[PDB]
Structure formats: C-alpha cells, structure tokens
Amino acid sequence: KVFGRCELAAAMKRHGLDNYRGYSLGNWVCAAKFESNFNTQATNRNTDGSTDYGILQINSRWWCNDGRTPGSRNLCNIPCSALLSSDITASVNCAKKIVSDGNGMNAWVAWRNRCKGTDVQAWIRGCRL
C-alpha cells in the first residue's frame, strides 16, 4: 500500500518514534521516503542472497526470516512477510530493535546518505499530528 507523508508521520508518532533513541520524527519519515517511497510492499534483492523488505527495507540477513538467506539471525523474530503488511506495526517494532543495536539509524543506507544532517523537520511540515 502507498502511504501519504502526513499519514505515515502520524502512524509513526502513535508508535512513538518521535525522539526514539534520540531521533526526531522527521528522521523516520525521511528514511521511509528514500528507502521505499512510502510503498509498504517495496522489495529489493541483494547480491548476497539477502533481501530488503517493506517501507523501511529491513534486511533478511539479520532481522527477518525469509527462508533463503545465508547467515540468517532472525533478530526481530518475524517472517519477512510480516514486513510487507499494509499496517506498519511489524516494521516499526523491528526498526526499534535495529536502532537499539548501536548503529542508530546508520543501518539505513538511505537515511545516512540523504537524511542525516538535513532539515528533517521539513518532513512533517503541515502535518496536523
């Protein structure tokens, strides 16, 4: 499903991402935007047997189980399909675990290369959250 910018922002605040582990709301809306274009079904197949799933493009190597990736650790204890749902519940819950690793949002290549250090506050401009 394709989320709206304010629409997704609200879902994230509800799930408490605003300032989670010191990352303002804007960082997450920015990360989704560049990672999946806010498409809940976005999928990317890597060169290493791994795949990136959902709106936050979580990798199957360490976070979810898709049954075909080498070195699977399945740290979120979820099947990768849970990450392709129309509701963001599983993606948000797993994301909170990724962020707590010690890498922060640095685990997301899009955040690091496109959001990090910018005016992230613009991402929630005009939202009535």
Side-chain angles (χ1 to χ4, degrees):
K1 103 148 236 174
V2 178
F3 272 81
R5 183 188 51 76
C6 291
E7 194 206 351
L8 174 66
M12 296 176 150
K13 169 174 172 215
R14 276 196 297 284
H15 278 97
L17 289 183
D18 195 22
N19 311 147
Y20 176 85
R21 284 284 212 173
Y23 295 97
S24 64
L25 183 56
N27 284 279
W28 310 96
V29 174
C30 186
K33 176 54 181 200
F34 288 110
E35 277 301 341
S36 68
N37 209 11
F38 305 138
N39 177 356
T40 62
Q41 282 185 320
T43 72
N44 174 73
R45 175 43 170 281
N46 300 309
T47 276
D48 75 330
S50 93
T51 302
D52 313 306
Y53 303 89
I55 208 153
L56 281 185
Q57 297 281 284
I58 301 182
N59 193 258
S60 60
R61 198 191 199 76
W62 281 29
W63 311 102
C64 67
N65 172 51
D66 68 2
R68 34 190 188 282
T69 323
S72 302
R73 291 178 180 198
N74 190 16
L75 272 8
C76 286
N77 188 52
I78 190 107
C80 298
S81 69
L83 298 178
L84 292 174
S85 58
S86 283
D87 72 284
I88 81 164
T89 310
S91 285
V92 157
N93 286 340
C94 180
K96 302 196 186 180
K97 212 279 144 292
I98 293 149
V99 148
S100 295
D101 190 55
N103 31 244
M105 297 203 61
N106 260 6
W108 289 276
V109 88
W111 180 81
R112 148 152 73 87
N113 289 64
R114 290 305 282 278
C115 308
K116 169 184 215 177
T118 74
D119 171 33
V120 295
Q121 266 292 296
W123 285 106
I124 63 185
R125 69 195 179 276
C127 302
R128 155 167 72 160
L129 309 183

